[PDB]
Amino acid sequence: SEVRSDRDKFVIFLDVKHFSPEDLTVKVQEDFVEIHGKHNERQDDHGYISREFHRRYRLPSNVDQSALSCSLSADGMLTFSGPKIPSGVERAIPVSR
Amino acid sequence: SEVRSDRDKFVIFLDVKHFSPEDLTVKVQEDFVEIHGKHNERQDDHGYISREFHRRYRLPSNVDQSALSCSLSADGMLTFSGPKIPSGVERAIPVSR
Numbered sequence A, B: 001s002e003v004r005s006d007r008d009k010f011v012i013f014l015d016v017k018h019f020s021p022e023d024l025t026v027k028v029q030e031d032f033v034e035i036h037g038k039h040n041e042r043q044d045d046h047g048y049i050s051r052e053f054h055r056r057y058r059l060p061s062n063v064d065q066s067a068l069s070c071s072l073s074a075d076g077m078l079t080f081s082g083p084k085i086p087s088g089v090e091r092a093i094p095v096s097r
Helices: none
Strands: A002-005 A009-015 A024-029 A032-042 A048-058 A069-072 A077-083 B002-005 B009-015 B024-029 B032-042 B048-058 B069-072 B077-083
Touching: A009 A032, A032 A077, B009 B032, B032 B077
Parallel strands: none
Antiparallel strands: A002 A009, A009 A077, A024 A032, A032 A048, A048 B048, A069 A077, B002 B009, B009 B077, B024 B032, B032 B048, B069 B077
16 A cells, blocks of 8 residues: 655555455545455365455545546556646656656 | 364464454354454544455364364464364374474
8 A cells, every 4th residue: 555645646556466356346435435355265175265355545635536547457556546636726846867 | 374184183373463353253164164354444544444354164074173272372373273083093203302
């Protein structure tokens, strides 16, 4: 987990390496991002393992909830992001190298 | 997880370091050991995290189900064990050093 928020955007990075994309759900409700995962795996000798989590995050009030995106990388990182809407009211300048 | 089984006993070791003793349940049913854990934690900014698992293990038919024990170590290791009942039918000899 890393949650980053700047003037331009809000981003959640969440390591979910033990989960398949179909195991995950992401919902936004009442100004919270709600992320759930559940993965079940058969073991040797008729055992099984279930891994499960929930993560609730507060969503800043200026994130555009009509422009949210979420993706899962091949290496198991979930990225959830949204741009911030300008309200009309120091500014970092990128240094290229 | 490590599951060990010798002529004397059956032992499950399971790392549950993110769980409190009150978060865990252990049940034996239909020749399976069923271990569950769920731990919820409040975060900063009104977030929360839930961690949850299930682990089902087959219990050997010769384990004495009247003499099962389970404990959680300070460092978060769960040990579940039972002795085997002698049936009446090579044998390792310990080497002390």
